[PDB]
């Protein structure tokens, strides 16, 4: 017997990401001998990106491939299921936390309460900022109307004085063009180029070579399926799909990084200047970020569990010192 | 319906072998029992360094080795695992293999050997265990050091050490009997499983900025006898490829968890962790770069692999034209 699932991705049509996602659906058919077929839908095709969560919960969609932290406002734990400012910043660290330090189970338990089955994370990229204004130091963020993905990311930029705005990636170009926003933090170089941000913003803002991405060094996506639809899939196919997503996580990551390398030369020719903030700017953001980690971690039991296990890991690899944590607890 | 005997480079009792044993159960699950792999720890069927020939001839259906062990016979394999001061993050090697053309190069080079290179298996960086303190670059001179040969051994030889090749299972007695002064094997957890802390009270690592100078990404892989592979139906071939890719990271994560738990054990065993300086790293760097090119030029496959990696490294700022002055592959 054959099963058919409709799954919408956060990737807009015409992006390297959507192409990768399409390819994934044929890999799934191959790995299941045609027994599990996924019909891909680009961002907005069935429901607005920010409403996918509820659309999957109710079953209009069988599943989704979102940027996990989009649900931070309704599920605090999701702010910890993707990178946050100055925390773990390498793909391998997130892989370790999810797959051996207990992250996958925390995520699954939190989503299960929502009637969703969190399959696993999908590696992706660090994020960059596109700005119409040259933001060369920490102090230049004050007063900047900045599109960000809400949650803890938005809070850190707000603490730096920015006026944060929540908008889907597909609405960023017109917002910049119309002056609704001055800058935008969406994804990496290749996809941002696909969407044309270089045409409406001549500056790319990045951290120092030591800390390239201050805010989102590991911007994870994932695959989350309606729980009822998941439970109806035979276990053999469930296990195959889990493996398929884990393989895709890195095939996706690899494809994005390839496109990114090819994108930098393009920005140069577009007349875009890549601006690098300093290590001092990183220290100013760090002082604001750590307290915010704790504020978000204490929201519920899931956010507490995710953050506590990530904090112990960070202590283990020298990413945080006891001194910096003075007065902070869960 | 299909049963394969596969031997790993991991010794029984190590964290690595437990992960590998678990992988065989996952494979059975992913193929509904149609493909069953019988796991064998290091040395069970044949000696670790003899796996290459065992699989080629079919004595073994496959193997899970540290890829650079074949550097002597296949120069390209020195480039299918990390080398001194090159790409040093798991994600970079993953990108190189899966989107920058590395997997195809590996498969073509192994097919000529009658072997099917499934894919790389992520693992860890490696550390050094020493009986005497090695606190600076200059202290490597005269050290009898166990290393995995190939390019890794040459860089250490260039630094004045006397390198020796021994499978991980022979390191403990060699250290205890004075045959070697130090040994680079794998990460902290497995080295602890092997008991190195009982015979050497120092661990030598690079600075925080470069913790692993010679082997930051010590990749393993799965390689199957070519005829055995071609005899396996396409659907199952594909499922095994996905199984190994999933395993790559489950294995990596398992090793990293064990490593975090190992550092406290070394402290309790009275072992001192020594960190070399940024200057020591620069000194090794001057030696390593020229060696990369020496090995790169050996054949069509090593030339293709390094050319690709060098372009990647220049793309991400890992090498400067200044450092490459007078060097061409």
Swiss-Prot record, chain A:
The keyword Metal-binding applies. GO terms for molecular function: calcium ion binding; protein homodimerization activity; zinc ion binding. Ca(2+) binds at residues 127, 185-186, 216. Disulfide bonds: none annotated. GO terms for cellular component: periplasmic space; tripartite ATP-independent periplasmic transporter complex. Transmembrane segments: none annotated. GO terms for biological process: lactate transport; transmembrane transport. PROSITE patterns: TAT. It is found in: Periplasm. Belongs to the bacterial solute-binding protein 7 family. PANTHER family: EXTRACYTOPLASMIC SOLUTE RECEPTOR PROTEIN, PTHR33376. Homodimer. The complex comprises the extracytoplasmic solute receptor protein TTHA0766, and the two putative transmembrane proteins TTHA0767 and TTHA0768. This is Lactate-binding periplasmic protein TTHA0766.
């Amino acid at each position: 017997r054959r099963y058919r699932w409709r799954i919408q991705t956060a990737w807009d049509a015409g992006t390297v990401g959507y192409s990768l996602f399409q390819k994934f659906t044929e890999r799934v058919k191959e790995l299941t001998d045609g027994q599990l077929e996924v019909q891909p839908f680009p961002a907005g095709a069935v429901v607005g990106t920010f409403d996918m969560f509820d659309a999957v919960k109710t079953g209009v969609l069988d599943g989704m491939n979102p940027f996990t932290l989009y649900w931070a406002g309704r599920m605090p734990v999701t702010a910890f299921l993707s990178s946050y400012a100055l925390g773990l910043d390498r793909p391998d660290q997130w892989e370790t936390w999810f797959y051996s330090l207990g992250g996958l189970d925390i995520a699954r338990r939190a989503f299960a309460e929502q009637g969703l089955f969190y399959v696993g994370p999908v590696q992706h990229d660090l994020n960059i900022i596109h700005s119409k204004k040259p933001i060369r130091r920490f102090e230049d963020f004050k007063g900047v109307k900045l599109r960000v993905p809400g949650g803890m990311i938005a809070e850190v930029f707000a603490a730096a004085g920015a006026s944060t705005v929540l908008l889907p990636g597909g609405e960023v170009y017109p917002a910049l063009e119309r002056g609704v926003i001055d800058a935008a933090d969406f994804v990496g170089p290749a996809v941002n180029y696909n969407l044309g941000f270089h045409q409406v913003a001549k500056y790319i803002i990045m951290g120092p070579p030591e800390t390239p991405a201050i805010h989102q060094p590991v911007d994870l996506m994932d695959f989350t399926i309606n729980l009822n639809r998941w439970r109806s899939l035979p276990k053999p196919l469930q296990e195959r799909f889990i493996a398929a997503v884990h393989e895709y996580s890195w095939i996706h990551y690899a494809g994005i990084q390839k496109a990114n390398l090819e994108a930098w030369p393009k920005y140069r020719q577009a007349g875009v200047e890549v601006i690098r903030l300093s290590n001092e700017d990183v220290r100013k953001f760090r002082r604001l970020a750590i307290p915010i980690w704790f504020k978000w971690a204490k929201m519920d039991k899931y956010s507490r569990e995710a953050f506590a296990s990530q904090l112990e890991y960070m202590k283990g690899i020298g990413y945080v010192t006891d001194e910096e944590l003075k007065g902070l607890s869960l």
